[PDB]
């Protein structure tokens, strides 16, 4: 890549700010067949839990206008398998690709166990605390509760801790502040909103889980609102996500206050969406008077109040 696209975030020295979002890229195996994963700034792999999980019954996905619903249920092979097979595979093929490990769980002790171990993996450069799984969340809706968790995990993590916020709250500001004061090195947002779809013939919800998480271009305006809201009073970097489908969106996230950008749902529509964005980015920057993304971050940051 080139200098104009590089950003420095805690634990993350990215060649470009394009990072596939958690749960949308597996552990990189499938998309490696499509293109050189080294073209990416980093990857946010699927949620890892202390114990392997099958997940929710099927159907697990549904389509909505400019978005989709999912209720996978945090399926993953467990920490042991992820530590011995998944992460090593990425480290063996793509040694220089920094990876962000997504961590989830049903209770504090579960989060703690994973955070304390997952950092041993040479290629894991940061942890993304998933306190926001929709269908996670019972930890992302109360500031004091979220803070308690973050503090505990921070005390045991060997790598920087990024916290993934939920958009399903009345006021995200108190939650963000609390999490920052508790020791979080950065934030990532947003996880999905909650939605439902009904099958007219059966009169029953399409998803077996009834409710699911809503993602895609449809939620971009909400993601921007929240990122912008949180950026106005947090002193730690934010990696934004929610409806990014092209380079223009990436730039819009920057205007909102993000430092790097994750792409989720778009990979399903177009498996080459990430490399495309990376390629179109410099042209777009030229057109909008942007010398480097590093300069854009600072410019948006000082143009506050």
């Amino acid at each position: 890549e080139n200098n104009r696209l590089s950003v420095k975030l805690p634990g993350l020295d990215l060649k470009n700010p394009i990072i596939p979002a958690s749960g949308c890229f597996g552990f990189g195996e499938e998309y490696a067949k499509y293109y050189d994963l080294n073209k990416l700034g980093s990857i946010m792999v699927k949620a890892t839990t202390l114990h392997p999980r099958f997940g929710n019954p099927t159907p697990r996905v549904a389509e909505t206008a400019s978005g989709m619903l999912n209720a996978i249920g945090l399926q993953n092979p467990g920490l042991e398998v992820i530590m011995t097979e998944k992460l090593p595979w990425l480290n063996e093929n793509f040694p220089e690709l920094p990876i962000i490990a997504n961590v989830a769980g049903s209770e504090e002790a579960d989060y703690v166990a994973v955070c304390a171990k997952i950092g041993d993996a040479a290629n894991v450069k940061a942890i993304e605390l998933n306190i926001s799984c929709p269908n996670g969340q019972a930890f992302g809706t109360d500031p004091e509760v979220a803070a308690a968790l973050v503090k505990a995990c921070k005390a045991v993590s060997k790598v920087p801790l990024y916290v993934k916020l939920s958009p399903n709250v009345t006021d995200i500001v108190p939650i963000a502040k609390a999490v920052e004061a508790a020791g979080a090195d950065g934030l990532t947002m947003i996880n999905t909103l909650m939605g439902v779809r009904f099958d007219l013939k059966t009169r029953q919800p399409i998803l077996a889980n009834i409710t699911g998480g809503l993602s895609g271009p449809a939620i971009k305006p909400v993601a921007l609102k929240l990122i912008h809201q949180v950026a106005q009073d947090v002193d730690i970097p934010i990696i934004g996500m929610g409806g990014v489908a092209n380079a223009q969106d990436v730039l819009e996230m920057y205007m909102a206050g993000a430092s790097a950008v994750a792409v989720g749902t778009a990979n399903f529509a177009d498996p080459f969406v990430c490399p495309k964005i990376i390629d179109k980015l410099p042209e777009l920057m030229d057109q909008y008077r942007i010398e480097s993304l590093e300069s854009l971050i600072q410019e948006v940051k000082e143009g506050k109040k």
Partner: peptide, 10 residues
């Protein structure tokens, strides 16, 4: 996704 990454079609 159709390629085995999303874990939807399980």
């Amino acid at each position: 996704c159709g390629i085995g990454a999303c874990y939807a079609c399980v």
